[PDB]
Design a protein around this ligand. Structure first.
Ligand SMILES: Nc1nc2c(ncn2[C@@H]2O[C@H](COP(=O)(O)OP(=O)(O)O)[C@@H](O)[C@H]2O)c(=O)[nH]1
Ligand SMILES: [Mg+2]
Lengths: 170, 322
């Protein structure tokens, strides 16, 4: 009887969803992963001394959901809304992804964590910490800054914290 | 009547049926039958009929309880009946009671009768976005998404006697296509053909061919750029593919976050791809996905789908094949 947590990584194109997922599961930074590939990953990890199965789907594409994408978006236990601190458009679309999850889930609130990625790119950073932290506290969801480029930053914590959010509900 | 001409046929009237996607279209006699789908708010289980000869829409006559409202199901025509299998069932708006299906419903065309084939024995796993076709008095369903992962299995069921029939898993051989869903299937010559689809990390523009006799798959070595041949169509999902006169016609689908409206044609015998040039008087259909296609006489018919901005469509287009 092991618990399974279905997590979905959503965000604009290029924010680093594939980089983060591959970093989290395969412990390697893979630059320029195929932007259209949308597949799922599986591990058994122990969070807070409790074993858990992690079922993560790296989303891709903005058109209508494939049968796989849809059922993941409808049954997912939590979502990682990811934007790039170098792409102001991705930040303005956090609201779009936020509304999408609630509309699909038909809920007033759902387990979500705002993820600011590519923090390593400091010279080209466009969105500050207060900007992202305000966005997160606006949607009443946690905020984590991440970087999938070696050495990775908060990649494991981001996914683990999402599980923790799920465990501390209802 | 101009050859190789797109023609915008009368769309499905709003009072007949809702503009939809993820529906199924089946050709029978001189009419196209639309079943199931997604109108943008709920699932559907109505049955529409487009009379090709005079371009008239109507709700098809149905008696008996139809299948539960669903989409991403399959529909095939065997003899004088339409067979619905699989799909996605539940309540979309409230996001509840969602499940894939593995049931089998028959729609008798002459009487409009809905009968459920309550099949005994071991069933194929409930799935959506699977592939399906009818060949050798049997229903063939292949691949799809089951809830946890994509599939690459294949099953048959005899459609001759409802009471004396059961499902059988096909021991496939050859290069089985990578686990896929949301792909079209067409039978030409005595082979079943599958192009692209949503296959995760293995998403490609490979063309697979399944010869029923030896139950073996073969990825047709294409893009013989050595021969300078035209390239294969871009990898995509949610597209349609129909067979007519030793050729496969691929249209629509979402390809790398775009909705191309090019018409691709694959010569099965010569293993060559081409882009069909529509006549000057053609009414080019917009790029779409999750639409549906069928063939009547020497013309292809496209209905529904999702166009740009997640807009459901009720348009019906006809491409004159010859
Ligand atoms: N410097 C840097 N580049 C990153 C990071 N994460 C992703 N990228 C780059 O962002 C681009 C697209 O990211 P990708 O992994 O494809 O993510 P996706 O497009 O959101 O699925 C590639 O050029 C990656 O190398 C990161 O943490 N740091
Ligand atoms: Mg990606």
């Amino acid at each position: 009887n092991l618990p399974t947590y279905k997590l979905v990584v959503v965000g604009d194109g290029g924010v680093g969803k594939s980089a983060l997922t591959i970093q989290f599961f395969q412990k390697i930074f893979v630059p320029d992963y195929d932007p259209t590939i949308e597949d799922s990953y599986l591990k058994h990890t122990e969070i807070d001394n409790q074993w858990a199965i992690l079922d993560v789907l790296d989303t891709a594409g903005q058109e209508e959901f494939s049968a796989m994408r849809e059922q993941y978006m409808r049954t997912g236990d939590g979502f990682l809304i990811v934007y790039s601190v170098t792409d102001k458009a991705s930040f303005e679309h956090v609201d779009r992804f936020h509304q999408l999850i609630l509309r699909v889930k038909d809920r007033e609130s759902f387990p979500m964590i705002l993820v600011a990625n590519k923090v390593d790119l400091m010279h080209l950073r466009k969105i500050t910490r207060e900007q992202g932290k305000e966005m997160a506290t606006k949607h009443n969801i946690p905020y984590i800054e991440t970087s999938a480029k070696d050495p990775p930053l908060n990649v494991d914590k981001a996914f683990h914290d999402l599980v923790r959010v799920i465990r501390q509900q209802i | 009547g101009t050859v190789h001409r797109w023609r915008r046929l009368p769309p499905c009237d709003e009072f007949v049926g809702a503009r939809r996607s993820k529906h199924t279209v089946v050709a029978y006699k001189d009419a196209i039958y639309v079943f199931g789908g997604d109108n943008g708010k709920t699932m559907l289980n109505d049955l529409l009929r487009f009379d090709v000869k005079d371009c008239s829409w109507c709700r098809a006559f149905t008696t008996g309880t139809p299948p539960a409202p669903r989409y991403h199901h399959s529909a095939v025509v065997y003899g004088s009946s339409m067979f619905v299998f699989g799909g996605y069932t539940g309540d979309i708006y409230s996001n509840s009671n969602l499940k894939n299906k593995n049931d089998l419903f028959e729609y008798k065309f002459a009487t409009g009768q809905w009968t459920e084939w309550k099949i005994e024995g071991r069933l194929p796993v409930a799935r959506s976005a699977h592939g399906a076709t009818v060949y050798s008095d049997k229903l063939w369903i292949f691949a799809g998404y089951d809830g946890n992962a994509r599939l690459n299995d294949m099953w048959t069921i005899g459609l001759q006697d409802r009471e004396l029939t059961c499902w059988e898993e096909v021991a496939q051989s050859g290069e089985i296509p990578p686990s896929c869903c949301n792909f079209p299937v067409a039978v030409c010559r005595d082979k079943m053909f599958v192009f692209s689809g949503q296959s995760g990390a293995k998403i490609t523009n490979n063309l697979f061919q399944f010869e029923f006799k030896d139950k073996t798959w073969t990825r047709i070595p294409t893009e013989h750029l050595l021969r300078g041949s035209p390239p294969p169509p871009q990898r995509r999902y949610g597209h349609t593919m129909v067979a007519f006169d030793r050729h496969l016609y691929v249209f629509g689908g979402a390809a790398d976050n775009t909705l191309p409206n090019e018409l691709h044609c694959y010569d099965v015998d010569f293993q060559t791809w081409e882009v069909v040039q529509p006549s000057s008087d053609s009414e080019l259909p917009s790029g779409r996905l999750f639409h549906a296609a069928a063939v009547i006489s020497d013309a292809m018919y496209i209905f529904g789908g999702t166009v740009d901005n997640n807009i459901r469509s009720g348009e019906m287009y006809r491409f004159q094949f010859s």
